[PDB]
Write a protein that binds this ligand. Sequence first.
Ligand SMILES: O=P(O)(O)O[C@H]1O[C@H](CO)[C@@H](O)[C@H](O)[C@@H]1O
Ligand SMILES: O=P(O)(O)O[C@H]1O[C@H](CO)[C@@H](O)[C@H](O)[C@@H]1O
Ligand SMILES: O=P(O)(O)O[C@H]1O[C@H](CO)[C@@H](O)[C@H](O)[C@@H]1O
Ligand SMILES: O=P(O)(O)O[C@H]1O[C@H](CO)[C@@H](O)[C@H](O)[C@@H]1O
Ligand SMILES: O=P(O)(O)O[C@H]1O[C@H](CO)[C@@H](O)[C@H](O)[C@@H]1O
Lengths: 380, 380, 387, 387, 387
Amino acid sequence: SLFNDKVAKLLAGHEALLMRKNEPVEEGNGVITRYRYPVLTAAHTPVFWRYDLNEETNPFLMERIGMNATLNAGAIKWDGKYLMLVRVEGADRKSFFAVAESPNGIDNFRFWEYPVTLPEDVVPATNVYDMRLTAHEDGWIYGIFCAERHDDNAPIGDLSSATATAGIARTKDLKNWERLPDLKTKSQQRNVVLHPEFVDGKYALYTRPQGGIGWALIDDITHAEVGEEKIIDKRYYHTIKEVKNGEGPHPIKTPQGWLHLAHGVRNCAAGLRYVLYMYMTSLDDPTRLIASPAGYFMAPVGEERIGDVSNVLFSNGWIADDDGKVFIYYASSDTRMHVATSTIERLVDYCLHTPQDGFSSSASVEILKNLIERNLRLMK
Amino acid sequence: SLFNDKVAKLLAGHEALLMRKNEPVEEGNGVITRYRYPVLTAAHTPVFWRYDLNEETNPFLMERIGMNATLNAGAIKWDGKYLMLVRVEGADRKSFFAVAESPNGIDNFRFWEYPVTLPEDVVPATNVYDMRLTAHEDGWIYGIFCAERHDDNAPIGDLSSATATAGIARTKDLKNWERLPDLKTKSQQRNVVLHPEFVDGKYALYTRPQGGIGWALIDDITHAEVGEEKIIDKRYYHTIKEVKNGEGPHPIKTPQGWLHLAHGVRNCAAGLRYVLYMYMTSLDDPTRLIASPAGYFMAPVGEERIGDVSNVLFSNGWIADDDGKVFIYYASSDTRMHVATSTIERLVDYCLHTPQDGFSSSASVEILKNLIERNLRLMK
Amino acid sequence: SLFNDKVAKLLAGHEALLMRKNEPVEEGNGVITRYRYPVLTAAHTPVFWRYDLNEETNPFLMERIGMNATLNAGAIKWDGKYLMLVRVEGADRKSFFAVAESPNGIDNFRFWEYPVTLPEDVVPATNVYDMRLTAHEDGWIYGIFCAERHDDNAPIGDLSSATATAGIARTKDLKNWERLPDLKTKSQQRNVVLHPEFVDGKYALYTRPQDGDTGSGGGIGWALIDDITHAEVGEEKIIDKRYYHTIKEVKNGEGPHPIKTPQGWLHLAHGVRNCAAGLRYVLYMYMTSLDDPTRLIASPAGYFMAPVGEERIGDVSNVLFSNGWIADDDGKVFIYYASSDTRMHVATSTIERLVDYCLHTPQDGFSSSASVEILKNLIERNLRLMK
Amino acid sequence: SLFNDKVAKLLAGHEALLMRKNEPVEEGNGVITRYRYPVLTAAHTPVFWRYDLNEETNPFLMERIGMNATLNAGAIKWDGKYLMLVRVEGADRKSFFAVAESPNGIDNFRFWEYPVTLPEDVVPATNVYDMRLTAHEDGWIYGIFCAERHDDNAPIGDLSSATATAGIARTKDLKNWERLPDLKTKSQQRNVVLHPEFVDGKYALYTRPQDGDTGSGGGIGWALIDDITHAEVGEEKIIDKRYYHTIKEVKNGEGPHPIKTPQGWLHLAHGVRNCAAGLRYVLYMYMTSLDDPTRLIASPAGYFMAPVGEERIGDVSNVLFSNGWIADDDGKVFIYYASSDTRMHVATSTIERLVDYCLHTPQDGFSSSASVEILKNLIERNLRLMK
Amino acid sequence: SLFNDKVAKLLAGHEALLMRKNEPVEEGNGVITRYRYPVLTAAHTPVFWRYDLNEETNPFLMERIGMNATLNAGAIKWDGKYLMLVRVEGADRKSFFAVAESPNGIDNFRFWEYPVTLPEDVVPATNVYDMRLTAHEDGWIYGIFCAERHDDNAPIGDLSSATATAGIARTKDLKNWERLPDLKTKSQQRNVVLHPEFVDGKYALYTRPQDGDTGSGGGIGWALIDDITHAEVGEEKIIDKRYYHTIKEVKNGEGPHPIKTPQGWLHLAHGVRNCAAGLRYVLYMYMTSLDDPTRLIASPAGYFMAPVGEERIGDVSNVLFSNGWIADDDGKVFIYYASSDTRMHVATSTIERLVDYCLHTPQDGFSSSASVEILKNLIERNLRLMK
Ligand SMILES: O=P(O)(O)O[C@H]1O[C@H](CO)[C@@H](O)[C@H](O)[C@@H]1O
Ligand SMILES: O=P(O)(O)O[C@H]1O[C@H](CO)[C@@H](O)[C@H](O)[C@@H]1O
Ligand SMILES: O=P(O)(O)O[C@H]1O[C@H](CO)[C@@H](O)[C@H](O)[C@@H]1O
Ligand SMILES: O=P(O)(O)O[C@H]1O[C@H](CO)[C@@H](O)[C@H](O)[C@@H]1O
Ligand SMILES: O=P(O)(O)O[C@H]1O[C@H](CO)[C@@H](O)[C@H](O)[C@@H]1O
């Protein structure tokens, strides 16, 4: 029948999309390797999420639930597989979470047949987004995310003013999630991320109160409340992290220190511009900066530049294999998910040996002239 | 001569552009079919609008009047042809109206040799735009449009603050236009559209006072003044119509009710984002909502994402043929005109059977899980 | 596992290929419409024809039986579907027959899981090819094909000399084939095709007699046969002749059996000429009378189709060939033609358009001067009109 | 109406094709510059040559007279324009001649509305082709071409054997052609070309005698003719010879008539060799003396041009051929060459560059060892320089 | 200056071409992996082979010595690098040999600055081609190649008749070549290749005897030679035979010398058949016994590789040819094959995969019926599995 043929073609085209082999982009900077194709797009969502496949109730075979974007994904290595905790945004403008898995980390990502069922906390949330997964030493996988609600204090007619809390959920199988109480805090918090080890016998969170990225020790993750907050990485005038910054995924432990991936924001004539940057902190004291490479680590290139919210890169997930290979999962323009690959050694090299920002054009020129001089002497 | 050869090539290239066959995009969602090429672009404007073709006064053969964009077009089926009432924006940044016609509705649109001569109302307007055509049962074709003027109340140096009225013109041939008085109203009005039937023996307008899309009965279209205004379709926090919405073309009458096409706006880091959405109202009471499919009906895809004002779809025109075929004319990024095709039956199906927005991530997930469950049971 | 993933990808990519929607080429001549993609290629053969899918016996997952080409296909409308009787050439250089079916006639052709099992006649054949299907009024589907054998009577070291007979098989399900005796004949025969109606109560074959080398072979012939189960040509009449400096100079041959129209029998054939690059094969058409199928009533000049674009290149370049087409009740015609002995294409038209083409394309006057006069006549008419 | 819209689209698309600006290919060898597009293809022939534009007689708007190829064109600068004398091959396999003109020489070639009306000589010809135009000092434009006829003296069934004469026509407007008697000759003649100056007060032809098969045919010949209106070759001298294992091994032939330069006559020819795929045709150049046009003074080794890219493929693949070029007063040269007997291309150079190429491309020493020594000499010079 | 800028651009573009990273083609058959780009083309030859870079003597900066093709390359692993012994064909139609080296085997092949200087044997040769390199256990690298000469004993005008001997040269640095006497033989010999081990204390050659025309030539032969410095074939045994209606019907010939594996000698050859477009060349494999290298132990049916895509087209289209491959210690195999006598490609595999292919690709049963039965067996196994 024509209908059954149409369904068979939808499924077949979908498998071909899902199984497509990714290829590295051979032109790069020696730090990260980009890939030809996104790892996830709205089109990667299962056909059976979008279409009613029953001819009796959907004779025209049209989509019943539109999917708009797959972005800002958390990430975890799980029972030998590479997993993203994807922020999926429907056509209805709500986001929800969904696990997608790949055998190799760069392609053949496929969503689990059901998305994430996330219980509400005492106060229901309208939107949930940007989950950071932490396999904590206490044996739980924590997902720390943004829980957004309409701002009650807003003037009538204002349907846009919003408040956000740090939502805290934990799981041991990524299917059954226990919702702990929202992070209690005096200042509003976004980009909250759980450090994977106890520090002074306490849970440690990366925070962004709304100075920069902060550090807060928490006695009880099941009754989490920020008290003291220490700033780790600061905003600076005329850098890539001028207006805002925020921690991405939780940092990777290396013998040289904690390796961090964050985003920085500035304002330009086209709106806000988001890029990724890195920093390192000490193993002895994770609050202490030990590497501050100047500038951005990654910025939108090519197709990445354009989407629902253009001029944005964002990452809240990466995976480092035992052999040192690193898979960085980053969204572009709040629309799609990409992967970039590197190694711990290369990322540490980049962090340690990219000159620090001297904070002015003159300083930048002197750093550059020093490198040129060395190279010309070599090339002679 | 070299000049005459150059003119002959301009005309020949233009005819080739105008006559190019459009092709449907085979990948779609079963609701609407997109097409490979725009139906109109600035390059579609006649060569003789842009160039002085006289070698004596234009020996270099350069454009004398630049055309920048062809957007936000009204639409009407006219004496067997498919017509757009195009908003054409010159390089001089002013818009004017111009009729363009096609024999088939998807390609070979060609502008009438002269654009629209639109008489001013008592107070002259600086810009005119976004005309909605209504073949009213009173025998007139009405064009309801935006008439924009500089805001007199603005502080010195402010050359941007503007006011807008709803301009009202009518015609029986789309060449000779009678300008009626601007809509009188206490609140500023935009996206005003004439309903094609009398209601309670009165003219009925779709309005957007500046809550949502409104309905206003008007005794006399030649002395039009809004009194009572009823809200039909509301803005909602965290939907595609959060900050603004507005009626597109006048709705299509179907046996199931009035079929509406509108736009919804939200704000993001890149500015305002415009998408299209649909709703239905009752035949018995056109003020009563009877279908509210969740989310967007169409959003910018591919080339649509980029233009003078990126991240925008806008429609103020569509045509439904007697056989049920629907031609939807939508602009992308305030730059070019596109066509999408569907049918009344498919659009009604989409409106009735796309689940309503439950207004939260949890609700969205439950709706989705219900569909997944049905499909997996089927596919077993 | 990695192996199971590899198999899954092979199958998925294969389904994506098989299901790809064809699109017409909008640039055409108003007679036929070409399509963007071939309807069949070697890559369309099932994955399970080429690979051993068992990890134990094929751990590297390589092809065990290479497929080289899908060409020269017969065709028939069958229980509501569009069927090709494909000549499939393996990497081993042998051809065999295989049914492939489509719901619409222009795409989504899929091979039946098993190819054709064709019993040998008394003398075994080395290669079999180019089957023409005829749903004859006697209730059988006949396939008439070429059965080729090495010429044992060859100089030592000559492993190329061959002979060929017209093989005759019949079936009612396209799975179980009965092999009748090879056509008996004094000349070598090729491109033999069964006419679908009895004529004077006899079976009628289109023939192409030739000495080996065409030699004295005059063209496409007509032979009445008393008994298809003991077929032997006696008298044969030439219906469509070769001509110097036409597209059918060196050889010609009937393609599929002709289509009956109210205006006469509509024929599709191929014509051959020699050039510096070898032999060049194009398609051409002609019509014969309903009253007397041996009588030519339409001879449009020149070729009907010739290799265009990708068609020009393959194992045997500069060749178009057809031995199958389907005409639906509504007049729509699907022409299945191979290019360069490598792949199968479809072209579409209608009976009315093909008849128009045959009747109104001027006949060949056989010289440059004659060609120029015909052309000048048309130019003169057009220029007056365009005035 | 739908029909009128279809006609309008045919005409508009045709004008867009005709007016397309050509672009040079920036990758080259410094001798010639190739161009992105052909200057003529079958699709360049007027819409009103191919379609009947009258709805009453062609309601489906199909082509009535198919055009297959535009090739082997003569050329002449004419009243300020660049003209090709095109060999146009119809779908009917006959060739005829047609003038096409361009304002600039690299694009916007358009056929004159009518093709060439060429009167027959006393014995009618079946095919006519490959015309070389010579604006002779006697005030006439001559076209010397090949007139081909079937060889009546052929075995039965042989419809391919042909004979050919050198046809001679002259004109002063390229519309009204007077047909002189075919060249009388003891050997078959092909690629005959008229030298543009009297030599010893006689007409001089470039010739290419051959037994049929070239056979004893030594190469490109020179024959003095007393009276062009009663042309008969008596004595002929060979000017440019075939050589084993060069690009002109099996056959060669003059292309257009040579260009006079202060250094001598600049010649463009083609050379043929046989390979596994058939005959391979490339272009080559040579120069002869002003004092004695029979005397070779430059013989650059190897080919001047060979098929590149799209040129490699057509009705007769692996062929380049030229019988026309134009040199402007400023020294710019437009070379019109066909590829694969299918389409026409242009390549540009200058007289100085072409003379440079002929004089300084080392002569063929006729062996691998000799080729290596020439190459090692150049490498040695370059490496010293690059030091 | 403009000239110096032009030279700089030539050199820079050349380096960009030479350094381009090759990429594997992900669509394959699991046996061999093809690559997106050729490893060598005529454009890969050094800029200083083709252009005179001196402004004083080449002010227009044109090529003085055109390069036409890079084909049929021998190959050897050499001091850690991957080397091709390339047959380079000039525009002058002569071939000569030239070493090109790569660090990785799939890209960045660069010609040595000078090509090969090969001394003549007592009788000079006109063309030399197709060298197979053998690192023999006697400590020499031998190159066995074809040395071609005009057949002086030809009808007048015949400049195409040729004879060819097997040329024998040896070297220890690939720069200084000693030319031994041409192989003495009663039949013409071509595709002669040196086996890398003594057999019964003698040198062993793969041979391909033929009357001219292959004629009585049975296939690929084996000849024991007492003294490589005075090589003469006495008795020769045929190892791999031609067969009617296979890919090696008309001709066959050994490619590079075989690879020793624990399972036997792994052979790569080419096979030829005739078709309407001329001769068609494909690659095939076979294996012989370690105990007795004359004894066939594996004969996979059909072709190993045939022209795909861009490979189909060149100076001599429809040809694949290989006379070189390299197997690394880890089992990785680099197969260097020419397409269409025009360009060089690489394909990769492993010894295990190639052995798997040879052992488990079913043998040719030599008929359509036999091919169908083999295929039906595999289909039946697969369908059971897929259940
Ligand atoms: O809180 P942040 O650091 O400013 O990030 C926010 O903006 C990003 C860009 O739109 C989004 O990608 C994020 O989801 C988030 O809404
Ligand atoms: O009044 P609205 O609904 O906000 O629409 C306006 O913005 C659109 C997007 O730039 C424009 O396309 C429209 O022309 C209009 O100016
Ligand atoms: O018998 P014919 O008319 O000469 O056709 C033959 O040649 C064709 C072209 O190679 C092949 O396609 C055919 O299969 C056949 O071998
Ligand atoms: O006479 P020549 O030199 O062999 O040239 C002939 O062959 C050419 C190549 O097919 C054709 O292009 C020519 O028209 C001609 O038929
Ligand atoms: O001797 P063989 O086996 O017939 O091979 C010959 O033909 C090949 C194809 O043209 C060429 O590639 C070879 O160089 C050779 O001329």
